[PDB]
Amino acid sequence: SRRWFHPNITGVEAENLLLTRGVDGSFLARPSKSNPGDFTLSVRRNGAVTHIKIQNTGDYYDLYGGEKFATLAELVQYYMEHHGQLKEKNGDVIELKYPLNCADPTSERWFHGHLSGKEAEKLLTEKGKHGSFLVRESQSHPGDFVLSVRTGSKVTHVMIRCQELKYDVGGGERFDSLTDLVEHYKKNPMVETLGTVLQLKQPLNTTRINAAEIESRVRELSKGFWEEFETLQQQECKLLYSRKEGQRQENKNKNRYKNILPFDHTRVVLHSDYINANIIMPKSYIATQGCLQNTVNDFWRMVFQENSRVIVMTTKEVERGKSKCVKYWPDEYALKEYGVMRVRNVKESAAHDYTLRELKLSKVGQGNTERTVWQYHFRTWPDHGVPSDPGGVLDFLEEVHHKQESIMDAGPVVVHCSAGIGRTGMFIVIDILIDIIREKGVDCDIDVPKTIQMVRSQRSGMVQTEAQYRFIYMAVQHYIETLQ
């Protein structure tokens, strides 16, 4: 529910809360202030609390003394089911049982704060349609709040009272949080004495902009990005789709990371049929993990079957001493057979930021089925964080786009890194956003969080860090600004 995630809590605070309001098996998750980017899973057992690090360095969440995951939500779901798997001192097992809910509404899409009554009516006027709503703090009766809704023709305002940390609309139920209050009236709408029904359909969109004003939006978010990224993160519980196929005993060894699996509904099916990969539709894409030694034949079968002619590799084979992907292509001028798949490395050309490999791909025994597959291999991604300038990624992407565009009836573009969710998500999203622009010019509407959220519903946790989030904005602004 993401209720168990507390965006504005301290470690000490976390300990008090679990100790007073919680019980054994209670837990919560919070950003770690012991060096940002991290997160902590705070859990109570034996009348005491332990804090457990989870790292995200761009590729995944790594629970210490636990598995690797695509989202915190998937992490929590996994340990709230599979009991005995979450171990403490490499021995003691901790049980996640009782999510300790957060009454802090800052990460809701519908929540603003700071905002005036009039600036509310303007945005609900400019941007809103039937059902759109927001909550803001009352300025006139401070400590209270106001819910404003459009019936798109009309803006209605409802006072929300805070009475010793409980919320009400002046009668009826007193709720533990504004989220509960909101969720209650989204399903149990209010009626005006007059007959109009206040449907709370969708929160007001405060992220879609005209592309011509990304310079503006960025500087605003630059003193911002975090609240917005976190608002998106809070939406990940809506995205817990089934991932049964990757979880079969037969398929387990085909996954590089056990718990980072493809959604059943968008997975690439091989005509065994399993590969850890998904179709991403916004030009379509396939997002996949870096090959294992034992999935290389599957990888090429996939490329063949889908008629993909471009492949984008966003990782070095080894980074920070860790293997990310196995070399799955021939030396230059060599030919190899991968099961029934044959690939020749016809030529390589290095540029500053990447290497290009021209590969010929075919089924063994059927030379009529040959086609040129172009592999772009991004080599300059840094150890930590993201690149300083987006010019590299950009020229890389524009070059990829043009190769794709110059081949008739080309299939999806295959994008991968290691888990296939971090840089992989970041590249696809950037590419989707620029596509819109090359088509519709500069006078058009783009929406970063919503675009990521659309992609997240097709493969788990696409775009992993706030650092990748910020980078997307920088990348698009750059492209915009150099279009003049």
XYZ file of all heavy atoms in Angstrom, residues 292-385:
796
model
N 22.964 -14.521 -19.308
C 23.757 -15.451 -18.524
C 24.470 -16.336 -19.545
O 24.120 -16.308 -20.727
C 22.844 -16.271 -17.606
C 22.189 -15.447 -16.494
C 21.032 -16.175 -15.817
C 23.262 -15.049 -15.475
N 25.465 -17.105 -19.104
C 26.144 -18.047 -19.994
C 25.142 -19.034 -20.582
O 25.284 -19.481 -21.720
C 27.258 -18.799 -19.260
C 28.226 -19.553 -20.181
C 29.157 -18.622 -20.983
O 29.142 -18.612 -22.224
N 29.985 -17.853 -20.269
N 24.113 -19.351 -19.805
C 23.118 -20.332 -20.219
C 21.850 -19.751 -20.875
O 20.922 -20.496 -21.184
C 22.735 -21.192 -19.025
C 22.265 -20.367 -17.843
O 23.054 -19.652 -17.219
N 20.976 -20.469 -17.520
N 21.811 -18.434 -21.095
C 20.667 -17.822 -21.787
C 21.051 -17.132 -23.094
O 20.211 -16.537 -23.763
C 19.863 -16.850 -20.880
O 20.731 -15.850 -20.333
C 19.193 -17.600 -19.746
N 22.322 -17.232 -23.459
C 22.807 -16.639 -24.699
C 22.069 -17.165 -25.949
O 21.786 -16.401 -26.878
C 24.343 -16.810 -24.835
C 24.829 -16.427 -26.224
C 25.064 -15.974 -23.793
N 21.752 -18.453 -25.983
C 21.021 -19.002 -27.125
C 19.600 -18.440 -27.139
O 19.030 -18.176 -28.193
C 20.947 -20.542 -27.065
C 22.320 -21.208 -26.979
O 23.350 -20.598 -27.270
N 22.333 -22.483 -26.591
N 19.022 -18.295 -25.951
C 17.683 -17.756 -25.817
C 17.664 -16.296 -26.307
O 16.779 -15.880 -27.061
C 17.233 -17.854 -24.351
C 17.181 -19.300 -23.839
O 16.820 -20.205 -24.623
O 17.493 -19.531 -22.647
N 18.659 -15.530 -25.878
C 18.779 -14.148 -26.268
C 18.758 -13.961 -27.783
O 17.948 -13.198 -28.300
C 20.040 -13.536 -25.669
C 20.222 -12.112 -26.021
C 19.557 -11.119 -25.311
C 21.046 -11.749 -27.086
C 19.719 -9.771 -25.642
C 21.204 -10.404 -27.434
C 20.544 -9.415 -26.701
N 19.636 -14.657 -28.499
C 19.632 -14.559 -29.964
C 18.360 -15.103 -30.615
O 17.917 -14.535 -31.602
C 20.886 -15.187 -30.603
C 22.114 -14.365 -30.403
C 23.185 -14.679 -29.627
C 22.380 -13.063 -30.953
N 24.108 -13.663 -29.661
C 23.644 -12.662 -30.474
C 21.683 -12.214 -31.815
C 24.228 -11.428 -30.827
C 22.261 -10.977 -32.158
C 23.515 -10.602 -31.662
N 17.788 -16.190 -30.090
C 16.511 -16.690 -30.614
C 15.458 -15.595 -30.536
O 14.646 -15.439 -31.450
C 15.991 -17.865 -29.803
C 16.713 -19.167 -30.002
C 16.261 -20.167 -28.938
N 14.816 -20.365 -28.978
C 14.068 -20.729 -27.942
N 14.617 -20.936 -26.749
N 12.760 -20.872 -28.106
N 15.477 -14.860 -29.418
C 14.555 -13.761 -29.177
C 14.754 -12.687 -30.213
O 13.791 -12.240 -30.827
C 14.756 -13.156 -27.780
C 13.875 -11.901 -27.521
S 14.072 -11.114 -25.893
C 15.623 -10.243 -26.088
N 16.002 -12.263 -30.396
C 16.304 -11.216 -31.368
C 15.842 -11.609 -32.777
O 15.280 -10.785 -33.519
C 17.799 -10.882 -31.403
C 18.105 -9.903 -32.580
C 18.267 -10.331 -30.039
N 16.055 -12.876 -33.120
C 15.688 -13.408 -34.428
C 14.180 -13.397 -34.592
O 13.632 -12.894 -35.573
C 16.187 -14.852 -34.558
C 15.977 -15.447 -35.923
C 16.947 -15.316 -36.908
C 14.816 -16.143 -36.220
C 16.767 -15.861 -38.159
C 14.626 -16.691 -37.471
C 15.607 -16.550 -38.446
N 13.515 -13.961 -33.601
C 12.089 -14.157 -33.642
C 11.335 -12.816 -33.769
O 10.325 -12.723 -34.472
C 11.700 -14.923 -32.388
C 10.261 -14.938 -32.009
C 10.120 -15.341 -30.557
O 10.666 -16.369 -30.140
N 9.431 -14.517 -29.766
N 11.852 -11.784 -33.109
C 11.175 -10.501 -33.027
C 11.611 -9.560 -34.136
O 11.107 -8.442 -34.254
C 11.418 -9.875 -31.660
C 10.883 -10.732 -30.521
C 9.363 -10.942 -30.589
O 8.654 -10.083 -31.173
O 8.875 -11.965 -30.056
N 12.555 -10.027 -34.944
C 13.051 -9.257 -36.064
C 13.719 -7.946 -35.620
O 13.766 -6.966 -36.371
C 11.908 -9.031 -37.055
C 12.383 -8.524 -38.403
O 13.251 -9.121 -39.033
N 11.816 -7.405 -38.845
N 14.239 -7.928 -34.393
C 14.984 -6.770 -33.910
C 16.274 -6.608 -34.726
O 16.931 -7.595 -35.055
C 15.354 -6.926 -32.439
O 14.245 -7.310 -31.667
N 16.648 -5.373 -35.034
C 17.827 -5.125 -35.853
C 18.760 -4.176 -35.100
O 19.898 -3.942 -35.507
C 17.427 -4.556 -37.218
C 16.149 -5.201 -37.808
C 16.401 -6.630 -38.354
N 17.289 -6.523 -39.503
C 16.896 -6.464 -40.775
N 15.616 -6.563 -41.094
N 17.810 -6.346 -41.732
N 18.291 -3.656 -33.968
C 19.147 -2.821 -33.157
C 19.132 -3.337 -31.740
O 18.091 -3.723 -31.236
C 18.746 -1.304 -33.195
C 19.681 -0.479 -32.328
C 18.752 -0.762 -34.630
N 20.299 -3.321 -31.106
C 20.464 -3.733 -29.719
C 21.276 -2.687 -29.010
O 22.317 -2.236 -29.508
C 21.282 -5.024 -29.615
C 20.561 -6.181 -30.300
C 21.586 -5.360 -28.155
C 21.437 -7.396 -30.462
N 20.824 -2.300 -27.836
C 21.485 -1.234 -27.098
C 21.961 -1.775 -25.768
O 21.167 -2.240 -24.944
C 20.516 -0.083 -26.864
C 21.065 0.891 -25.815
C 20.181 0.600 -28.197
N 23.264 -1.731 -25.565
C 23.837 -2.294 -24.365
C 24.279 -1.121 -23.517
O 25.070 -0.293 -23.962
C 25.007 -3.220 -24.728
C 25.628 -3.954 -23.560
S 26.837 -5.201 -24.092
C 27.595 -5.649 -22.537
N 23.739 -1.022 -22.310
C 24.030 0.127 -21.459
C 25.008 -0.159 -20.320
O 25.128 0.624 -19.384
C 22.757 0.700 -20.852
O 22.112 -0.319 -20.082
C 21.836 1.180 -21.943
N 25.717 -1.268 -20.396
C 26.645 -1.597 -19.336
C 27.960 -2.074 -19.944
O 27.994 -2.567 -21.076
C 26.048 -2.696 -18.413
O 26.774 -2.766 -17.181
C 26.099 -4.048 -19.087
N 29.049 -1.905 -19.207
C 30.258 -2.638 -19.540
C 30.027 -4.047 -19.037
O 29.151 -4.269 -18.195
C 31.491 -2.005 -18.901
C 32.031 -0.831 -19.713
C 33.328 -0.255 -19.130
C 33.072 0.493 -17.820
N 31.988 1.521 -17.961
N 30.776 -5.008 -19.570
C 30.607 -6.401 -19.160
C 30.877 -6.558 -17.676
O 30.236 -7.364 -17.004
C 31.536 -7.300 -19.951
C 31.454 -7.080 -21.432
C 32.495 -7.880 -22.183
O 32.736 -9.060 -21.803
O 33.074 -7.319 -23.143
N 31.824 -5.773 -17.174
C 32.136 -5.734 -15.748
C 32.238 -4.299 -15.227
O 32.931 -3.468 -15.808
C 33.440 -6.472 -15.434
C 33.187 -7.971 -15.371
C 34.500 -6.137 -16.478
N 31.535 -4.021 -14.129
C 31.579 -2.708 -13.487
C 31.772 -2.876 -11.981
O 31.077 -3.675 -11.348
C 30.293 -1.912 -13.761
C 29.880 -1.837 -15.231
C 28.856 -0.735 -15.503
O 28.223 -0.268 -14.536
O 28.693 -0.321 -16.679
N 32.715 -2.125 -11.418
C 32.993 -2.149 -9.979
C 33.373 -3.546 -9.498
O 33.102 -3.912 -8.355
C 31.793 -1.628 -9.175
C 31.211 -0.310 -9.684
C 31.876 0.904 -9.047
N 30.984 1.578 -8.106
C 30.821 1.214 -6.837
N 31.494 0.177 -6.352
N 29.986 1.885 -6.053
N 33.989 -4.324 -10.386
C 34.424 -5.673 -10.070
C 33.352 -6.735 -10.244
O 33.634 -7.929 -10.109
N 32.126 -6.311 -10.545
C 31.012 -7.247 -10.695
C 30.689 -7.522 -12.149
O 30.770 -6.632 -12.986
C 29.763 -6.716 -9.996
C 29.863 -6.698 -8.480
C 28.646 -6.036 -7.850
C 28.562 -4.562 -8.247
N 27.358 -3.912 -7.665
N 30.320 -8.764 -12.446
C 29.862 -9.114 -13.790
C 28.461 -8.571 -13.979
O 27.611 -8.686 -13.096
C 29.865 -10.629 -14.006
O 29.632 -10.941 -15.370
N 28.225 -7.969 -15.131
C 26.932 -7.379 -15.416
C 26.289 -8.121 -16.574
O 25.075 -8.308 -16.629
C 27.102 -5.899 -15.743
C 27.529 -5.061 -14.541
C 26.519 -5.213 -13.419
C 26.842 -4.338 -12.224
N 25.756 -4.428 -11.190
N 27.124 -8.568 -17.493
C 26.638 -9.217 -18.688
C 27.800 -9.991 -19.258
O 28.946 -9.547 -19.178
C 26.170 -8.169 -19.701
S 25.303 -8.848 -21.129
N 27.513 -11.155 -19.823
C 28.558 -11.924 -20.478
C 28.695 -11.501 -21.942
O 27.714 -11.162 -22.599
C 28.328 -13.452 -20.346
C 27.962 -13.803 -18.911
C 27.243 -13.927 -21.291
N 29.927 -11.489 -22.430
C 30.168 -11.283 -23.842
C 29.344 -12.289 -24.630
O 29.617 -13.488 -24.577
C 31.649 -11.473 -24.139
C 31.986 -11.324 -25.602
C 33.403 -10.851 -25.791
C 33.725 -10.775 -27.274
N 33.397 -12.043 -27.985
N 28.328 -11.811 -25.344
C 27.429 -12.705 -26.079
C 27.522 -12.568 -27.592
O 26.608 -12.986 -28.316
C 25.985 -12.482 -25.649
C 25.504 -11.065 -25.829
C 24.970 -10.640 -27.035
C 25.585 -10.154 -24.791
C 24.534 -9.356 -27.201
C 25.150 -8.869 -24.939
C 24.618 -8.468 -26.143
O 24.178 -7.168 -26.288
N 28.624 -11.976 -28.050
C 28.880 -11.724 -29.463
C 30.315 -12.102 -29.754
O 31.171 -11.971 -28.881
C 28.688 -10.230 -29.783
C 29.655 -9.351 -29.047
C 30.870 -8.928 -29.485
C 29.496 -8.827 -27.717
N 31.480 -8.170 -28.513
C 30.660 -8.096 -27.420
C 28.487 -8.918 -26.752
C 30.834 -7.437 -26.199
C 28.661 -8.266 -25.537
C 29.824 -7.533 -25.274
N 30.588 -12.550 -30.993
C 31.918 -12.913 -31.501
C 32.969 -11.808 -31.405
O 32.618 -10.631 -31.420
C 31.648 -13.179 -32.987
C 30.218 -13.557 -33.058
C 29.526 -12.796 -31.989
N 34.246 -12.180 -31.353
C 35.336 -11.227 -31.588
C 35.114 -10.616 -32.965
O 34.407 -11.209 -33.791
C 36.701 -11.932 -31.621
C 37.097 -12.534 -30.288
O 36.968 -11.835 -29.258
O 37.548 -13.705 -30.281
N 35.725 -9.460 -33.230
C 35.617 -8.872 -34.560
C 36.147 -9.854 -35.603
O 37.173 -10.482 -35.393
C 36.341 -7.521 -34.648
C 36.108 -6.778 -35.979
C 36.693 -5.366 -36.008
O 37.719 -5.130 -35.324
O 36.120 -4.498 -36.712
N 35.409 -9.995 -36.701
C 35.730 -10.916 -37.810
C 35.448 -12.407 -37.551
O 35.485 -13.221 -38.467
C 37.148 -10.685 -38.356
C 37.344 -9.265 -38.802
C 38.354 -8.481 -38.268
C 36.503 -8.698 -39.751
C 38.525 -7.160 -38.676
C 36.657 -7.382 -40.159
C 37.672 -6.619 -39.620
O 37.837 -5.314 -40.025
N 35.129 -12.757 -36.315
C 34.773 -14.132 -36.011
C 33.296 -14.452 -36.228
O 32.441 -13.567 -36.338
C 35.183 -14.479 -34.600
N 33.012 -15.745 -36.263
C 31.659 -16.261 -36.399
C 31.461 -17.267 -35.257
O 32.404 -17.966 -34.892
C 31.523 -16.944 -37.760
C 30.277 -17.721 -38.162
C 29.195 -16.811 -38.720
C 30.658 -18.754 -39.192
N 30.255 -17.316 -34.689
C 29.894 -18.299 -33.656
C 28.507 -18.898 -33.857
O 27.644 -18.309 -34.513
C 29.934 -17.688 -32.248
C 31.264 -17.763 -31.536
C 31.036 -17.821 -30.027
C 32.325 -17.609 -29.222
N 32.789 -16.193 -29.235
N 28.309 -20.082 -33.279
C 26.992 -20.718 -33.234
C 26.503 -20.759 -31.787
O 27.218 -21.177 -30.877
C 26.999 -22.123 -33.869
C 27.065 -22.115 -35.415
C 27.125 -23.512 -36.062
O 26.765 -24.515 -35.401
O 27.532 -23.598 -37.253
N 25.290 -20.271 -31.572
C 24.707 -20.263 -30.252
C 23.470 -21.118 -30.362
O 22.391 -20.637 -30.727
C 24.349 -18.839 -29.847
C 25.552 -17.939 -29.709
C 25.845 -16.988 -30.668
C 26.406 -18.049 -28.623
C 26.949 -16.154 -30.542
C 27.511 -17.214 -28.486
C 27.775 -16.265 -29.458
O 28.865 -15.432 -29.365
N 23.632 -22.401 -30.071
C 22.588 -23.342 -30.385
C 22.411 -23.315 -31.886
O 23.365 -23.545 -32.631
N 21.206 -22.983 -32.332
C 20.886 -22.982 -33.754
C 21.140 -21.615 -34.367
O 21.056 -21.429 -35.582
C 19.431 -23.407 -33.976
C 19.270 -24.883 -33.631
C 18.484 -22.564 -33.112
N 21.478 -20.653 -33.520
C 21.704 -19.294 -34.001
C 23.163 -19.051 -34.348
O 24.076 -19.409 -33.604
C 21.235 -18.273 -32.974
C 19.763 -18.415 -32.608
S 18.693 -18.100 -34.016
C 17.433 -19.316 -33.662
N 23.373 -18.416 -35.486
C 24.708 -18.126 -35.949
C 24.856 -16.608 -36.067
O 23.959 -15.916 -36.602
C 24.922 -18.803 -37.305
C 26.293 -19.389 -37.508
C 26.515 -19.804 -38.965
N 26.586 -21.256 -39.122
C 25.802 -21.950 -39.941
N 24.900 -21.313 -40.678
N 25.921 -23.273 -40.029
N 25.972 -16.090 -35.544
C 26.260 -14.669 -35.665
C 27.691 -14.376 -36.082
O 28.655 -14.885 -35.501
C 25.830 -13.838 -34.399
C 26.332 -14.463 -33.163
C 26.336 -12.400 -34.482
N 27.816 -13.555 -37.114
C 29.117 -13.055 -37.536
C 29.342 -11.604 -37.081
O 28.475 -10.755 -37.259
C 29.229 -13.121 -39.055
C 30.608 -12.712 -39.562
C 30.630 -12.734 -41.065
N 30.286 -14.061 -41.547
C 31.179 -15.027 -41.700
N 32.459 -14.793 -41.416
N 30.793 -16.219 -42.135
N 30.498 -11.320 -36.494
C 30.887 -9.937 -36.227
C 31.623 -9.342 -37.446
O 32.832 -9.503 -37.614
C 31.721 -9.838 -34.941
C 32.036 -8.391 -34.547
O 31.854 -7.464 -35.334
N 32.526 -8.203 -33.323
N 30.873 -8.654 -38.296
C 31.410 -8.135 -39.552
C 32.363 -6.942 -39.394
O 33.351 -6.839 -40.113
C 30.271 -7.813 -40.548
C 30.742 -6.868 -41.616
C 29.763 -9.095 -41.178
N 32.094 -6.066 -38.435
C 32.896 -4.858 -38.276
C 32.646 -4.218 -36.911
O 31.542 -4.290 -36.377
C 32.566 -3.856 -39.404
C 33.247 -2.491 -39.306
C 34.778 -2.596 -39.414
C 35.434 -1.281 -39.893
N 35.109 -0.084 -39.044
N 33.672 -3.596 -36.341
C 33.471 -2.748 -35.174
C 34.023 -1.351 -35.430
O 35.069 -1.200 -36.046
C 34.118 -3.359 -33.934
C 33.553 -4.714 -33.582
C 34.109 -5.263 -32.282
O 34.816 -4.513 -31.568
O 33.828 -6.444 -31.968
N 33.302 -0.333 -34.979
C 33.839 1.021 -34.969
C 33.590 1.703 -33.627
O 32.448 1.833 -33.173
C 33.291 1.872 -36.123
O 32.002 1.455 -36.528
N 34.677 2.135 -33.001
C 34.612 2.851 -31.741
C 34.387 4.344 -31.966
O 34.927 4.949 -32.893
C 35.885 2.615 -30.926
N 33.543 4.914 -31.125
C 33.380 6.348 -31.047
C 33.828 6.661 -29.645
O 34.261 5.766 -28.924
C 31.933 6.736 -31.250
N 33.721 7.909 -29.228
C 34.194 8.207 -27.899
C 33.362 7.494 -26.840
O 33.911 6.883 -25.923
C 34.221 9.699 -27.609
C 34.645 9.994 -26.206
N 35.773 9.435 -25.646
C 34.064 10.730 -25.231
C 35.887 9.840 -24.393
N 34.863 10.630 -24.120
N 32.041 7.552 -26.992
C 31.128 7.168 -25.916
C 30.613 5.752 -25.997
O 29.998 5.256 -25.058
C 29.941 8.121 -25.900
C 30.236 9.370 -25.142
O 30.730 9.231 -24.003
O 29.997 10.472 -25.691
N 30.868 5.110 -27.124
C 30.280 3.824 -27.385
C 30.994 3.127 -28.530
O 31.733 3.756 -29.280
C 28.794 4.009 -27.710
C 28.527 4.690 -29.033
C 28.508 3.962 -30.220
C 28.268 6.050 -29.099
C 28.262 4.570 -31.443
C 28.004 6.674 -30.316
C 28.006 5.929 -31.486
O 27.748 6.540 -32.695
N 30.740 1.832 -28.670
C 31.266 1.038 -29.777
C 30.082 0.527 -30.558
O 29.032 0.228 -29.988
C 32.105 -0.159 -29.266
O 33.247 0.330 -28.560
C 32.591 -1.056 -30.414
N 30.242 0.453 -31.869
C 29.224 -0.117 -32.726
C 29.722 -1.437 -33.305
O 30.830 -1.512 -33.823
C 28.867 0.837 -33.869
C 27.794 0.246 -34.791
C 26.564 -0.201 -33.961
C 27.384 1.239 -35.852
N 28.894 -2.472 -33.216
C 29.221 -3.759 -33.796
C 28.193 -4.158 -34.837
O 26.996 -4.189 -34.552
C 29.330 -4.809 -32.703
C 30.474 -4.527 -31.772
C 30.862 -5.740 -30.935
N 30.872 -5.383 -29.521
C 31.857 -4.719 -28.931
N 32.922 -4.334 -29.624
N 31.751 -4.420 -27.647
N 28.660 -4.420 -36.058
C 27.781 -4.881 -37.125
C 27.821 -6.400 -37.092
O 28.877 -7.010 -37.251
C 28.216 -4.332 -38.492
C 27.259 -4.646 -39.654
C 27.755 -4.131 -41.023
O 28.648 -3.252 -41.050
O 27.257 -4.608 -42.076
N 26.667 -6.998 -36.837
C 26.559 -8.431 -36.655
C 25.620 -8.991 -37.710
O 24.636 -8.336 -38.058
C 26.016 -8.761 -35.256
C 26.724 -8.149 -34.037
C 25.931 -8.420 -32.762
C 28.164 -8.654 -33.897
N 25.929 -10.185 -38.223
C 25.003 -10.905 -39.095
C 24.416 -12.045 -38.313
O 25.157 -12.840 -37.739
C 25.710 -11.473 -40.328
C 26.503 -10.463 -41.134
C 25.669 -9.267 -41.558
C 26.518 -8.279 -42.370
N 25.713 -7.211 -43.047
N 23.094 -12.148 -38.304
C 22.413 -13.161 -37.504
C 21.584 -14.073 -38.393
O 20.954 -13.606 -39.333
C 21.517 -12.486 -36.467
C 20.525 -13.351 -35.682
C 21.268 -14.339 -34.838
C 19.562 -12.496 -34.805
N 21.594 -15.379 -38.101
C 20.860 -16.358 -38.908
C 20.638 -17.664 -38.180
O 21.386 -18.024 -37.275
C 21.593 -16.643 -40.232
O 22.952 -16.999 -40.020
N 19.598 -18.388 -38.570
C 19.450 -19.743 -38.085
C 20.447 -20.616 -38.830
O 20.631 -20.483 -40.039
C 18.035 -20.268 -38.308
C 17.069 -20.030 -37.161
C 15.786 -20.807 -37.409
C 14.550 -20.058 -36.929
N 13.316 -20.413 -37.709
N 21.101 -21.501 -38.094
C 21.968 -22.492 -38.702
C 21.170 -23.316 -39.720
O 20.083 -23.797 -39.423
C 22.596 -23.406 -37.622
C 23.178 -24.630 -38.242
C 23.668 -22.652 -36.849
N 21.693 -23.451 -40.931
C 21.054 -24.293 -41.926
C 20.105 -23.547 -42.836
O 19.546 -24.139 -43.752
N 19.927 -22.251 -42.581
C 18.989 -21.420 -43.334
C 19.584 -20.031 -43.603
O 19.325 -19.082 -42.862
C 17.667 -21.286 -42.563
C 16.434 -21.803 -43.315
C 15.228 -22.005 -42.393
O 15.382 -22.152 -41.179
N 14.025 -22.011 -42.970
N 20.382 -19.915 -44.665
C 21.109 -18.685 -44.953
C 20.231 -17.592 -45.537
O 20.596 -16.406 -45.536
N 19.071 -18.002 -46.054
C 18.050 -17.068 -46.524
C 17.558 -16.152 -45.405
O 17.136 -15.020 -45.659
C 16.869 -17.827 -47.148
C 16.353 -18.962 -46.256
O 17.134 -19.724 -45.667
N 15.031 -19.081 -46.160
N 17.638 -16.645 -44.172
C 17.146 -15.939 -42.999
C 18.164 -14.986 -42.399
O 18.024 -14.576 -41.254
C 16.793 -16.912 -41.875
O 17.991 -17.536 -41.395
C 15.809 -17.959 -42.350
N 19.202 -14.632 -43.139
C 20.162 -13.719 -42.561
C 19.689 -12.260 -42.570
O 19.002 -11.808 -43.492
C 21.529 -13.859 -43.211
C 22.651 -13.450 -42.283
C 23.919 -13.176 -43.039
O 23.827 -12.605 -44.149
O 25.006 -13.530 -42.536
N 20.057 -11.543 -41.513
C 19.793 -10.125 -41.410
C 20.877 -9.456 -40.557
O 21.412 -10.078 -39.637
C 18.390 -9.857 -40.852
C 18.290 -9.793 -39.333
C 18.286 -11.151 -38.670
N 17.306 -12.037 -39.279
C 16.004 -12.003 -39.033
N 15.505 -11.131 -38.176
N 15.195 -12.843 -39.653
N 21.194 -8.198 -40.882
C 22.144 -7.394 -40.118
C 21.553 -6.821 -38.822
O 20.561 -6.086 -38.840
C 22.672 -6.211 -40.946
O 23.205 -6.680 -42.189
C 23.770 -5.509 -40.195
N 22.174 -7.148 -37.699
C 21.743 -6.627 -36.413
C 22.814 -5.650 -35.951
O 23.996 -5.969 -35.984
C 21.522 -7.790 -35.393
C 21.145 -7.267 -34.028
C 20.433 -8.715 -35.894
N 22.410 -4.450 -35.557
C 23.367 -3.415 -35.152
C 23.381 -3.292 -33.637
O 22.335 -3.096 -33.010
C 23.017 -2.068 -35.796
C 22.976 -2.129 -37.294
C 21.917 -2.502 -38.078
C 24.043 -1.818 -38.184
N 22.267 -2.431 -39.406
C 23.570 -2.027 -39.498
C 25.358 -1.389 -38.000
C 24.365 -1.822 -40.621
C 26.153 -1.183 -39.113
C 25.653 -1.394 -40.411
N 24.560 -3.431 -33.044
C 24.680 -3.375 -31.594
C 25.463 -2.158 -31.122
O 26.653 -2.034 -31.395
C 25.354 -4.636 -31.063
C 25.395 -4.690 -29.541
C 26.673 -5.323 -29.031
O 27.725 -5.213 -29.670
N 26.599 -5.985 -27.873
N 24.795 -1.274 -30.397
C 25.444 -0.104 -29.840
C 25.803 -0.362 -28.390
O 24.960 -0.742 -27.582
C 24.526 1.109 -29.949
C 24.329 1.578 -31.360
C 23.351 1.006 -32.169
C 25.118 2.599 -31.892
C 23.163 1.437 -33.471
C 24.936 3.043 -33.194
C 23.955 2.451 -33.981
O 23.768 2.856 -35.284
N 27.063 -0.162 -28.054
C 27.517 -0.543 -26.737
C 28.051 0.649 -25.956
O 29.176 1.107 -26.183
C 28.570 -1.642 -26.880
C 28.981 -2.265 -25.582
N 29.917 -3.271 -25.510
C 28.596 -2.010 -24.308
C 30.085 -3.623 -24.243
N 29.297 -2.869 -23.498
N 27.240 1.150 -25.032
C 27.601 2.364 -24.313
C 28.661 2.088 -23.267
O 28.442 1.319 -22.333
C 26.377 3.025 -23.679
C 26.588 4.469 -23.327
C 26.312 5.464 -24.252
C 27.069 4.829 -22.082
C 26.503 6.796 -23.929
C 27.271 6.143 -21.756
C 26.989 7.134 -22.677
N 29.815 2.726 -23.424
C 30.980 2.356 -22.626
C 31.376 3.356 -21.550
O 32.221 3.051 -20.707
C 32.188 2.132 -23.535
C 31.998 1.073 -24.601
C 33.341 0.749 -25.243
N 33.615 1.514 -26.464
C 34.172 2.724 -26.498
N 34.502 3.358 -25.371
N 34.384 3.312 -27.672
N 30.793 4.549 -21.586
C 31.290 5.629 -20.737
C 30.445 5.950 -19.498
O 30.683 6.960 -18.835
C 31.578 6.930 -21.551
O 30.391 7.353 -22.230
C 32.678 6.688 -22.581
N 29.477 5.098 -19.172
C 28.691 5.322 -17.965
C 29.642 5.252 -16.774
O 30.528 4.391 -16.742
C 27.535 4.318 -17.842
C 26.501 4.704 -16.793
C 26.523 4.377 -15.466
C 25.310 5.499 -16.987
N 25.430 4.909 -14.826
C 24.672 5.602 -15.730
C 24.727 6.126 -18.093
C 23.473 6.304 -15.555
C 23.541 6.822 -17.913
C 22.931 6.909 -16.652
N 29.504 6.193 -15.820
C 30.428 6.304 -14.680
C 30.198 5.271 -13.570
O 29.131 4.650 -13.499
C 30.165 7.716 -14.153
C 28.766 8.013 -14.563
C 28.560 7.325 -15.877
N 31.219 5.089 -12.731
C 31.153 4.227 -11.553
C 29.944 4.527 -10.683
O 29.158 3.639 -10.356
C 32.406 4.420 -10.695
C 33.550 3.553 -11.133
O 33.307 2.622 -11.927
O 34.687 3.796 -10.673
N 29.819 5.791 -10.297
C 28.742 6.220 -9.423
C 27.877 7.249 -10.120
O 28.372 8.061 -10.908
C 29.295 6.839 -8.134
C 30.327 6.000 -7.451
N 31.656 6.003 -7.826
C 30.230 5.134 -6.415
C 32.331 5.172 -7.052
N 31.489 4.633 -6.185
N 26.585 7.222 -9.808
C 25.661 8.224 -10.302
C 25.440 8.141 -11.795
O 25.469 7.064 -12.390
